[PDB]
Design an enzyme around this catalytic site. Structure first.
Site, mmCIF file in Angstrom:
data_model
loop_
_atom_site.group_PDB
_atom_site.id
_atom_site.type_symbol
_atom_site.label_atom_id
_atom_site.label_comp_id
_atom_site.label_asym_id
_atom_site.label_seq_id
_atom_site.Cartn_x
_atom_site.Cartn_y
_atom_site.Cartn_z
ATOM 1 N N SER A 159 8.015 -0.122 -18.981
ATOM 2 C CA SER A 159 6.848 0.385 -18.271
ATOM 3 C C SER A 159 7.021 0.116 -16.781
ATOM 4 O O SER A 159 7.213 -1.024 -16.390
ATOM 5 C CB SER A 159 5.578 -0.286 -18.793
ATOM 6 O OG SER A 159 4.383 0.261 -18.252
ATOM 7 N N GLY A 160 7.119 1.177 -15.998
ATOM 8 C CA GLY A 160 7.285 1.070 -14.556
ATOM 9 C C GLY A 160 8.707 1.214 -14.063
ATOM 10 O O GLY A 160 8.959 1.043 -12.873
ATOM 11 N N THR A 206 8.880 8.758 -15.272
ATOM 12 C CA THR A 206 8.016 9.867 -14.844
ATOM 13 C C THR A 206 8.433 10.434 -13.508
ATOM 14 O O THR A 206 8.358 11.651 -13.312
ATOM 15 C CB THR A 206 6.573 9.425 -14.848
ATOM 16 O OG1 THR A 206 6.217 9.155 -16.194
ATOM 17 C CG2 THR A 206 5.637 10.449 -14.277
ATOM 18 N N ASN A 241 2.263 -0.925 -14.446
ATOM 19 C CA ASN A 241 2.413 0.311 -13.673
ATOM 20 C C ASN A 241 1.069 0.837 -13.177
ATOM 21 O O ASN A 241 0.133 0.943 -13.953
ATOM 22 C CB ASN A 241 3.107 1.386 -14.524
ATOM 23 C CG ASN A 241 3.604 2.581 -13.743
ATOM 24 O OD1 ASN A 241 3.311 2.749 -12.560
ATOM 25 N ND2 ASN A 241 4.360 3.452 -14.385
ATOM 26 N N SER A 252 0.758 4.558 -15.082
ATOM 27 C CA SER A 252 1.434 4.418 -16.362
ATOM 28 C C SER A 252 1.144 5.616 -17.223
ATOM 29 O O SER A 252 -0.020 5.983 -17.338
ATOM 30 C CB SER A 252 0.980 3.151 -17.078
ATOM 31 O OG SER A 252 1.753 2.942 -18.249
ATOM 32 N N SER A 253 2.183 6.227 -17.845
ATOM 33 C CA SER A 253 1.984 7.374 -18.741
ATOM 34 C C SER A 253 1.504 6.843 -20.069
ATOM 35 O O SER A 253 2.213 6.064 -20.691
ATOM 36 C CB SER A 253 3.280 8.147 -18.958
ATOM 37 O OG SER A 253 4.014 8.310 -17.760
ATOM 38 N N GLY A 288 6.849 3.886 -21.590
ATOM 39 C CA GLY A 288 7.862 2.836 -21.546
ATOM 40 C C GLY A 288 7.551 1.578 -22.324
ATOM 41 O O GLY A 288 6.390 1.338 -22.657
ATOM 42 N N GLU A 307 6.422 -1.883 -23.287
ATOM 43 C CA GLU A 307 5.456 -2.755 -22.629
ATOM 44 C C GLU A 307 5.026 -3.984 -23.427
ATOM 45 O O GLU A 307 4.974 -3.976 -24.660
ATOM 46 C CB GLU A 307 4.223 -1.971 -22.176
ATOM 47 C CG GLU A 307 3.388 -1.403 -23.301
ATOM 48 C CD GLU A 307 2.384 -0.373 -22.826
ATOM 49 O OE1 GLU A 307 2.660 0.314 -21.814
ATOM 50 O OE2 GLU A 307 1.318 -0.252 -23.470
HETATM 51 N N1 LIG Z 1 12.884 7.114 -7.778
HETATM 52 C C1 LIG Z 1 11.778 6.548 -7.279
HETATM 53 N N2 LIG Z 1 11.591 6.569 -5.940
HETATM 54 C C2 LIG Z 1 10.497 5.992 -5.434
HETATM 55 N N3 LIG Z 1 9.510 5.359 -6.073
HETATM 56 C C3 LIG Z 1 9.724 5.349 -7.395
HETATM 57 C C4 LIG Z 1 10.797 5.913 -8.065
HETATM 58 N N4 LIG Z 1 10.667 5.736 -9.435
HETATM 59 C C5 LIG Z 1 9.541 5.078 -9.557
HETATM 60 N N5 LIG Z 1 8.919 4.807 -8.367
HETATM 61 C C6 LIG Z 1 7.708 4.014 -8.172
HETATM 62 O O1 LIG Z 1 7.388 3.382 -9.399
HETATM 63 C C7 LIG Z 1 6.081 3.792 -9.854
HETATM 64 C C8 LIG Z 1 6.111 3.928 -11.356
HETATM 65 O O2 LIG Z 1 7.248 4.723 -11.747
HETATM 66 P P1 LIG Z 1 7.088 5.698 -12.995
HETATM 67 O O3 LIG Z 1 8.111 6.759 -12.884
HETATM 68 O O4 LIG Z 1 5.660 6.069 -13.144
HETATM 69 O O5 LIG Z 1 7.468 4.727 -14.202
HETATM 70 P P2 LIG Z 1 7.514 4.905 -15.787
HETATM 71 O O6 LIG Z 1 7.334 6.394 -16.019
HETATM 72 O O7 LIG Z 1 8.870 4.398 -16.239
HETATM 73 O O8 LIG Z 1 6.362 4.084 -16.319
HETATM 74 C C9 LIG Z 1 5.774 5.065 -9.072
HETATM 75 O O9 LIG Z 1 4.368 5.247 -8.906
HETATM 76 C C10 LIG Z 1 6.470 4.804 -7.735
HETATM 77 O O10 LIG Z 1 5.681 4.002 -6.859
HETATM 78 O O1 VO4 Z 2 4.562 3.073 -17.247
HETATM 79 V V1 VO4 Z 2 5.196 4.120 -18.244
HETATM 80 O O2 VO4 Z 2 6.683 3.745 -18.521
HETATM 81 O O3 VO4 Z 2 4.398 4.048 -19.604
HETATM 82 O O4 VO4 Z 2 5.059 5.565 -17.689
HETATM 83 MG MG LIG Z 3 5.632 7.346 -16.942
#
Ligand SMILES: Nc1ncnc2c1ncn2[C@@H]1O[C@H](COP(=O)(O)OP(=O)(O)O)[C@@H](O)[C@H]1O
Ligand code: VO4
Ligand SMILES: [Mg+2]
Length: 691
Positions: free
Chosen positions: A123-124, A128, A172, A175-176, A395, A397
């Protein structure tokens, strides 16, 4: 300044490893770690840390790619970068998510195969963001050559879905709370023709529940921002989130989020997607009604009776139903007596739960409706022949309190990790036997079948939960008892909880760590029952959206003389894995560098934990020990005949006559196998002769 044996990596207690033989200064910040002379845990860790220090957040590691969240905007995603990456082979450009998208596009047209870009991560980690960057690349490339064009709608589908399906969690800020598989459809010649989204398991509990350190879905706060005051007017609501119980149980404001700007982005997306004002306002109305629904108080006359109709009235109007009928559906639900009905009694405890259930059902069905609408505009009925699917799941968590939702999320992550394991370690080596290649099977210790079988297989955590629901006199502690009597001391991955901090019922050794689960309410969460008297009112509602969300509803089957959440989740997940097997997968492994969202900071133990449970080192060794590039003798003759003018006996003479290390390639039954790098030398030599 470097010495072959004076510069060595030594283990550490606080930072994993500190400055195994170090790699020479020529391999500093190397774009592919399978080219490192020394392959060990600190050699991979420090190369990623060195590249990360220079804001180089992508690094190839064998056939797949790794990416470390920068936590800051970088100028690496501009349309200049997009247009430049088009056509570029993997080695002809720095590591990037754009290079993965373009090379998946190349394999699609070259091999006439569907591709998939499978993005893993905690997660984070950045799944996404990387998913939105793949979609961005494809749309920007297709565009080169009110409601906008296909490419713009494809882009705007994610901010529209994120408002209702994303929320702040401890790990996050965005968070999705659902998984999605986006398919990007291309014609025979390669033109972008269409797209579709398939969403998986939205966290319903979040609509009416929040932990201390987390928010409900973004949409609630976006409306309450007041940037569109006509919305507050329409919804008969205040501007204070703390006035709505369903949405203000934990946190209400996120520093990294401007809810006001996001409300505009959300509304703008529904516009570009072709949503009518009746559609938009209907969705807003339902969101508003859900807030009001949570404030409905009840009391004893045991039997519940409404305690003030003020909020019950506001909800009934936005929904388009009779306020008194809504309150009598909740309090005295109908029981079918053939062609007649009898009211059942409900105490305050029951009505409150029923209200919560209907609020989560409306919200979930609204999200599924919205996805369908997005799909209906993305459906262009243009000639399509292939597709490139992108998988963005919720992700891995671990919260201070882990419930059913976390098990469903972490289970999918385990499943996706096993998909990587099977493809990279089992299928790959099985191809060396198929092609008659000299190959001793390597056991890389990458097999989570033990934990997967513990959850999904018969008599496993989910099978136990599924049967238990179908017992009226079954309690939380009978479920815990069945879980323990069957798995404690028998399943290695099932352990007694390792516990001030919320009480846990059991422990699970997941691929990414031990997660303490609490089984309270799992039986009711899996059953997902509804007050069908109210859902009946919903079907007859004067708001077309609410009537259509519940038109497909199939009630409690009629009795005769003499389906669960986890079951549908395994069913979806298995259908997903079986369909992914028919595609060429491209793995993007996302690494969260530090817990505190700090840009540039790299927590060496947190990074090393990810690289280990992901199997990055194992995945690099297989590429180094094997032959990653394979060409059919006919296709090889077609392209490389120019170097020195039977398909196999031709490739044998050609390769022997050229000036190369004749041990870097082996001959298969139908394909010539090349080691890492050798393919690039032959392509470089073909470039020298084609001028
Ligand atoms: N490639 C990237 N460049 C800049 N910031 C990023 C990048 N990937 C993630 N982030 C930062 O991390 C946060 C969460 O990433 P996200 O893609 O939502 O994570 P996940 O989908 O794995 O939970 C985003 O809101 C942003 O602030
Ligand atoms: O924070 V996520 O990895 O559930 O998008
Ligand atoms: Mg996500």
């Amino acid at each position: 300044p470097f010495d072959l044996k004076k510069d060595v990596f030594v283990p550490d207690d606080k930072q994993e490893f500190v400055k195994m033989q170090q790699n020479p200064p020529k391999f500093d910040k190397i774009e592919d770690m399978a080219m490192l002379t020394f392959l060990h845990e600190p050699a991979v860790l420090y190369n990623l840390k060195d590249r990360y220090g220079s804001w180089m957040i992508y690094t190839y590691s064998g056939l797949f790619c790794v990416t470390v969240n920068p936590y800051k905007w970088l100028p690496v995603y501009t349309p200049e970068v997009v247009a430049a990456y088009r056509g570029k082979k993997r080695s002809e450009a720095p590591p990037h998510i754009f290079s993965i998208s373009d090379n998946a596009y190349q394999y699609m047209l070259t091999d006439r195969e569907n591709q998939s870009i499978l993005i893993t991560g905690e997660s984070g980690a950045g799944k996404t963001v990387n998913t939105k960057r793949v979609i961005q690349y494809f749309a920007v490339i297709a565009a080169i050559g009110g409601k906008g064009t296909l490419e713009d709608q494809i882009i705007q589908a994610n901010p529209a879905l994120e408002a209702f399906g994303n929320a702040k969690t401890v790990r996050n800020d965005n968070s999705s709370r659902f998984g999605k598989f986006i398919r990007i459809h291309f014609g025979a010649t390669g033109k972008l023709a269409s797209a579709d989204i398939e969403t998986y398991l939205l966290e319903k509990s979040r609509v009416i529940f929040q932990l201390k350190a987390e928010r409900d879905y973004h949409i609630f706060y976006q409306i309450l921002s007041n940037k569109k005051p006509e919305l507050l007017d329409m919804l008969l609501i205040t501007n204070n989130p703390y006035d709505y119980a369903f949405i203000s149980q934990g946190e209400t404001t996120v520093a990294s989020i401007d809810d006001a700007e996001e409300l505009m982005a959300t509304d703008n997306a529904f516009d570009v997607l072709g949503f009518t004002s009746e559609e938009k306002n209907s969705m807003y109305k339902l969101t508003g009604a859900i807030m009001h629904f949570g404030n409905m108080k009840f009391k004893l006359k045991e039997q519940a009776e409404p305690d003030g109709t003020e909020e019950a009235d506001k909800s009934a109007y936005l929904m388009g139903l009779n306020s008194a009928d809504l309150l009598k559906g909740l309090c005295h639900p109908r029981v079918k007596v053939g062609n007649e009905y009898v009211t059942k009694g409900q105490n305050v405890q029951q009505v409150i739960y029923a209200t919560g259930a209907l609020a989560k059902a409306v919200y979930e069905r609204m999200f599924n409706w919205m996805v369908t609408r997005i799909n209906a505009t993305l459906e262009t009925k243009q000639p399509r022949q292939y597709f490139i699917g992108v998988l963005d799941i919720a992700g891995f968590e671990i919260f201070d309190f882990n419930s059913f939702e976390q098990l469903c999320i972490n289970f999918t992550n385990e499943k996706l990790q096993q998909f990587f394991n099977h493809h990279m370690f089992v299928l790959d080596q099985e191809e060396y036997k198929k092609e008659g290649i000299e190959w001793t099977f390597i056991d890389f210790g990458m097999d989570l079948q033990a934990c997967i079988d513990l959850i999904e297989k018969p008599m496993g955590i989910m099978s136990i939960l599924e049967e238990e629901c179908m017992f009226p006199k079954a309690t939380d502690m009978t479920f815990k008892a069945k879980l323990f009597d069957n798995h404690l001391g028998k399943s290695a991955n099932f352990q007694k909880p390792r516990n001030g901090k919320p009480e846990a019922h059991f422990s699970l050794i997941h691929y990414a760590g031990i997660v303490d689960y609490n089984i309270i309410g799992w039986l009711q969460k899996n059953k997902d029952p509804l007050n069908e008297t109210v859902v009946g009112l919903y079907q007859k509602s004067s708001l077309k959206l609410l009537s259509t969300l519940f038109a497909n509803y199939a009630g409690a089957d009629a009795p005769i003389e003499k389906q669960t959440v986890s079951a549908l989740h395994r069913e979806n997940l298995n259908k997903l894995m079986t369909n992914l097997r028919s595609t060429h997968p491209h793995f993007v492994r996302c690494i969260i560098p530090n817990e505190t969202k700090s840009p540039g900071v790299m927590d060496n133990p947190l990074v090393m934990h990810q690289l280990r449970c992901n199997g990055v080192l194992e995945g690099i060794r297989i590429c180094r020990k094997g032959f990653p590039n394979r060409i059919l003798y006919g296709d090889f003759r077609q392209r490389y005949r120019i170097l020195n003018p039977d398909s196999r006996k031709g490739a044998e003479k050609l390769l022997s006559s050229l000036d190369i290390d004749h041990n870097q390639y082996k001959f298969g039954h139908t394909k010539v196998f090349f080691k890492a790098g050798l393919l690039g030398l032959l392509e470089e030599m073909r470039d020298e002769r084609l001028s």
